Write the structure tokens for this entry.
Amino acid sequence: PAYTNSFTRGVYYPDKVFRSSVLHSTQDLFLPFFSNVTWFHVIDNPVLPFNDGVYFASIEKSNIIRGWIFGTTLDSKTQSLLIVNNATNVVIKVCEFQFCVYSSANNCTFEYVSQPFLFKNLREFVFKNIDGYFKIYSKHTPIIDLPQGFSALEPLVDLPIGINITRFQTLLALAAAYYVGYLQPRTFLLKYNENGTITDAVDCALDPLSETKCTLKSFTVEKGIYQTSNFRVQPTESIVRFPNITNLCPFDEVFNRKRISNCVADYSVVSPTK
Amino acid sequence: DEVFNATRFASVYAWNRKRISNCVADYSVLYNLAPFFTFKCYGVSPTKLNDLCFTNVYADSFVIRGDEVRQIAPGQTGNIADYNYKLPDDFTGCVIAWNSNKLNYLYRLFRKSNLKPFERDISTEIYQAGNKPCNGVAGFNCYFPLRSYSFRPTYGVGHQPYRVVVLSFELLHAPATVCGPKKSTNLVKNKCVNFNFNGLKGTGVLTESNKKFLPFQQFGRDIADTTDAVRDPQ
Amino acid sequence: SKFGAISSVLNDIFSRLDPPEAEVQIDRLITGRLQSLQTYVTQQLIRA
Amino acid sequence: SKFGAISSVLNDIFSRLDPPEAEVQIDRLITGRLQSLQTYVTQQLIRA
Amino acid sequence: QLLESLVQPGRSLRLSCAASGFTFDDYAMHWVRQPPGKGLEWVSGSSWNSGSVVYADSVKGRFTISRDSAKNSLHLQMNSLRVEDTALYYCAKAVDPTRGSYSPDYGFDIWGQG
Amino acid sequence: AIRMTQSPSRVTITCRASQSISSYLNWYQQKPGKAPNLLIYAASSLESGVPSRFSGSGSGTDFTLTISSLQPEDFATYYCQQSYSTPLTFGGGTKVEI
Amino acid sequence: TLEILDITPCSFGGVSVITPGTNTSNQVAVLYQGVNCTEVPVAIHADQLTPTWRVYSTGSNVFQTRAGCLIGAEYVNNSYECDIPIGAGICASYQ
Ligand SMILES: *[C@@H]1O[C@H](CO)[C@@H](O[C@@H]2O[C@H](CO)[C@@H](O)[C@H](O)[C@H]2NC(C)=O)[C@H](O)[C@H]1NC(C)=O
Ligand SMILES: *[C@@H]1O[C@H](CO)[C@@H](O[C@@H]2O[C@H](CO)[C@@H](O)[C@H](O)[C@H]2NC(C)=O)[C@H](O)[C@H]1NC(C)=O
Ligand SMILES: *[C@@H]1O[C@H](CO)[C@@H](O)[C@H](O)[C@H]1NC(C)=O
Ligand SMILES: *[C@@H]1O[C@H](CO)[C@@H](O)[C@H](O)[C@H]1NC(C)=O
Ligand SMILES: *[C@@H]1O[C@H](CO)[C@@H](O)[C@H](O)[C@H]1NC(C)=O
Ligand SMILES: *[C@@H]1O[C@H](CO)[C@@H](O)[C@H](O)[C@H]1NC(C)=O
Ligand SMILES: *[C@@H]1O[C@H](CO)[C@@H](O)[C@H](O)[C@H]1NC(C)=O
């Protein structure tokens, strides 16, 4: 798999609130700055893991990428998401979708039809599935490698999809180069324009200089020394160790000053929930 | 009326989700005394429900045993809560449940792990319960993950049918399409007048602006995080 | 800042929560905003 | 100092209390620690 | 209540274990042979979920088991009973399959009465 | 198949299996005049109504049934049986002596 | 299992950054207060950090100071007037 650097790409509007000429800092799932992208080049289309959302972009000159398939096993045993689209309109359906597009599907729980979503085209996409909500962001920009620059993404469609989405497969209509990124929790300091558009932003977890900008709440840092609050990536690994004894407890024979010890208190026989 | 008078609700494992939008949701209709025994709302007082505007209203209805209504609350764990239907801790909605003992239902009791909130697991994959990785439909250690409730009419409260409807509404943060019935008056500009913009309340001098909005935006905010620019309905 | 309240907007709490329980969230906001004023004036006095 | 909380250990409060009940206690503890911290800063400013 | 019901080498005696209280077709009723002066030994196994049936592998073919929901029994059929094979037979009910995890059906319970 | 022979013949009873059973064991108590009853499930658990004095520990190829203080009227036989694979085979069998 | 294990903290929230001004240059030097130059990777868990942060966590330009370990600046044997104070008679500048 080819690898290419992402020069400050994937910034999208976190909320629907209009802000003008202000520096807003938010914590959500974003593509890390100067991260690294699997440059899949079409002569191909393997199944890739959708973890913590996926950043998608295409450099297709014409209509080649016809959509995507989202799911966990992409078979008839479970249900999958299909976002195929022709020139007239977009098709979104949630079924098992036994593939070879789909041979058959009897369960039907969702169907949404809207306007179509789709080397001089940069049709970026960001998909997120949080709390059973599929959020799609997109942007369109002529290009004439990943184009360096800045461009925000606007929300398009939010759907109540309650399915596993662990692996996604790109659809081809066989001259294109589709990129796949991955989103991780980061803190971004977004600068809003006077007209209400995101023009510049920094990744507070990228490098020490960006940490200073995040702490100072400004995009320009003067000479001197500055103390910075830790915006670095926190550990995400947890270990739990408890005694491996299975002596239960003498609570049963109780049903008068007796203590209980050296036993595992199975309370199913201070918060009561915990 | 299609979610309360339907007379045929979905199974818990297959809770259908219905979207309600572009209408007026007057909650005064569903205040009958005999039904709606439990009206536990989270984040919104039941009395102050009519005079609010919502943008994401979804109605999912299912039939479960009356003794299992407790599990529907956020944070609770149980066979229904962990393997059939899960609700987030940061839940904003009202859970109306009414007894229907006087008035086939399948619930999933076997699963590899508890499901995330707002997810549907409708599949008949055989849940193995032994060292043998049996793929057969049935076997000694192979059990089907779905079974009918088979409600007993004689049972009073325990193991009785209990229709449950959940109204998960997102609080006003975007262009809303569902709101309560309130009369709309003509706007007055260039004067300090009290206003009520889609549930937002306050006083100020309403004036036109040259700011440019976007189709997905409805409110402007300032450095102090207050509603500065609002596009009026109609 | 919300200072532990549901929302930073005062009118939001009243429009959502019942008067018996909306006051508790308000007290968190009132006390939190009061300390900011006391902190600000203290800095002015020292700087003066 | 307890600062009118169940336990000075933040972790203790989390494990021994429900999420809607914990938020009251940590807010009580957070305010106490913040109040004590800003008192020391004020003394330093005066002594400076 | 799992109530249940010779010297010559060739016999065709029918062994049936009536079921009461618990509901049939929910667990895996099994038959276990216990020779006097010795321990238990599982010899037969039925399945509620399907018609699949497993006997003891000590000797095949001779062991046969069946099911009947109307009269709630097993009606084990024994052919060519060995002289040493004489023992006090037990009909046991499997644990609730709702437990899951490790094999619930293979785990014996109740062990009948008498 | 699977064969066992309990090593014993504060009472601790250990049944050893040739293969890695990995917590697929049951401990059975059989009264002289009654049918055997269930004591331990999944090689570490207690069934409903069973006194807590009984305890099952160990996994893999080592298991232990520990009864503390040797509570009286517990002279019944104790059996060790596996559910790993067919056929269902019981252990050698051992009864506590006093 | 009875086993005594040492718990070395891996959360160092205090970091001082020396910059000659974003306008002047992007190059920056990092200072850790009261830490050896060997415990820096352990203290900030540079293994789990971004690849850009590892450059300022352990490199050739390492010069321990009374204040702490300094990374990103080279120690010059000459002496000039102070430009950016560091501590214990040490000053830094972007030559
Ligand atoms: C693109 O796909 C959509 C989805 O199938 C097509 O819309 C269908 O059009 C036929 C006839 O025009 C209708 O009978 C179907 O009901 C439509 N589907 C839905 C979901 O409404 C559309 O025609 C396609 N456009 C093309 C092929 O150019
Ligand atoms: C969604 O898919 C994930 C994929 O990881 C499932 O996680 C599996 O969980 C089981 C036990 O619950 C493990 O044995 C598997 O190794 C996990 N991965 C896979 C690929 O199966 C998860 O069960 C699915 N469902 C939900 C609700 O998350
Ligand atoms: C992609 O870039 C990152 C830079 O942060 C690097 O750490 C990673 O090794 C690269 N992947 C490659 C070269 O396969
Ligand atoms: C379709 O729905 C039925 C309803 O129970 C289900 O049994 C079947 O497995 C489903 N088919 C799929 C998911 O392919
Ligand atoms: C903002 O919008 C106005 C009006 O459309 C336009 O004249 C101006 O150039 C815009 N400014 C920016 C920075 O986009
Ligand atoms: C717990 O694990 C240790 C480590 O192997 C072992 O020595 C001990 O016997 C185990 N405890 C029990 C009760 O099995
Ligand atoms: C139908 O539902 C409404 C609530 O929306 C309720 O008031 C009415 O009584 C129901 N119909 C009957 C016949 O009970």
